[PDB]
Amino acid sequence: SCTVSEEDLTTIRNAIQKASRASLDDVNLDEDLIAKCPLLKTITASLKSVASEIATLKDTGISEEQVDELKQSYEQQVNEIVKSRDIFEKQSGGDVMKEQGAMINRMTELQVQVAQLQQQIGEQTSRMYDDMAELIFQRLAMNSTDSIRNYTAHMMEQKLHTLMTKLETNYRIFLGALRYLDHLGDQPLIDKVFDGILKRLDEMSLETNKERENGKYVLVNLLCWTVNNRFLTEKYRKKQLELFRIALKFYPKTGNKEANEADIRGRQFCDANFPVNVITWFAVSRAAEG
Ligand code: NA
């Protein structure tokens, strides 16, 4: 259950407003207060998540003009929640002594509005990542069959390597690239990019935690990309043995299946079992046959 006192609701309101600002700091609520209403934990986790995602945007090559448009959108949307009379203000008129006035119902409506804000910002940033990925393909002159038609094999390989070094450092950029290729419907380009992803996965260094993180997201979502796509599923089929080799490189200890599966599912942006099956089952079984 959730009980909040009248004055504690006022400090929740101010703590939410303070999370909207240019500093985007973590909501720091007293533990006694969190204890009486643990629902607050997921609200504060949501706002932290949005701010941490806006911070990642700055690190990329996205223009700080666009980051400013995003930060003001976030700020306006949080102020809308702060101003909500159903959540924070006394019941008035025909609302006096409605059930909605109970603190549990105010906090539930706060959780809904914060969850919907997180979804809306998620949609905006996801569009920004689409645009950034496309810009990468354009700047590298790799954005169509026509652009790549007159590349030698050596230059094509060189271009694909450069492309992967830019896509792999932020999995949301990588996902944006996959969405851009899907919508373009240029199959010779998809064919080559698939080869390029496999070659990077097969050879990239895995010395640091950041490199293993980059590779694992790329591997898992490459597999997701093939699901329900005949052409990409056929590409998986032809390069099956190489993907098994890559899978056991990123997920070596075949015995800790449960932890690997949880790790894989946390990086997945499809809902399919196929990435888990490839990495923790097919690859493990096929290395063992002989
Ligand atoms: Na108060």
How far apart are the CA of 187 and the centre of ligand 1, in A?
61
How far apart (Å, rounded) are the C-alpha atoms in residues 162 and 165? Answer: 5
How far apart (Å, rounded) are the C-alpha atoms in residues 146 and 62? Answer: 27
* Structural domain of 32: 6-130
Looking at the fold, whether 109 and 162 belong to one and the same domain comes out as no
How far apart (Å, rounded) are the C-alpha atoms in residues 95 and 86? Answer: 9
Under a CB-based contact definition with an 8 Å cutoff, are residues 224 and 272 in contact?
yes
Residue 37 within a domain: yes
Looking at the fold, whether 171 and 276 belong to one and the same domain comes out as yes
Looking at the fold, whether 194 and 119 belong to one and the same domain comes out as no
For CA atoms 74, 77, 82, 83, the dihedral sign is positive
**Other Cβ atoms within 10 Å of 116 Cβ, number:** 12
- How many domains does one find in the chain? 2
Looking at the fold, whether 152 and 118 belong to one and the same domain comes out as no
How far apart are the CA of 233 and the centre of ligand 1, in A?
59
Determination technique used: X-ray
How far apart (Å, rounded) are the C-alpha atoms in residues 199 and 165? Answer: 12
Looking at the fold, whether 116 and 147 belong to one and the same domain comes out as no
How far apart are the CA of 91 and the centre of ligand 1, in A?
14
Cα–Cα–Cα angle for 170, 45, 261, rounded to 5 degrees: 55
Which alpha helices (H) appear in the chain, and where do they start and end? 6-18, 31-36, 39-59, 64-82, 85-88, 103-139, 145-148, 153-167, 171-184, 187-203, 209-226, 230-238, 240-250, 257-267, 274-277, 283-288
Domain end among 130, 153, 176? 130
Domain end among 85, 100, 130? 130
Residue 223 within a domain: yes
273 is written with which tokens?
């079992």
Looking at the fold, whether 157 and 124 belong to one and the same domain comes out as no
Under a CB-based contact definition with an 8 Å cutoff, are residues 102 and 142 in contact?
no
Residue 116 within a domain: yes
Domain end among 88, 110, 130? 130
Looking at the fold, whether 96 and 37 belong to one and the same domain comes out as yes
Q: Which residues surround ligand 1, an ion (CB under 5 A)?
A: 7, 10
How far apart are the CA of 197 and the centre of ligand 1, in A?
56
How far apart are the CA of 224 and the centre of ligand 1, in A?
50
Q: At 5, phi and psi to the nearest 5?
A: -85, 165
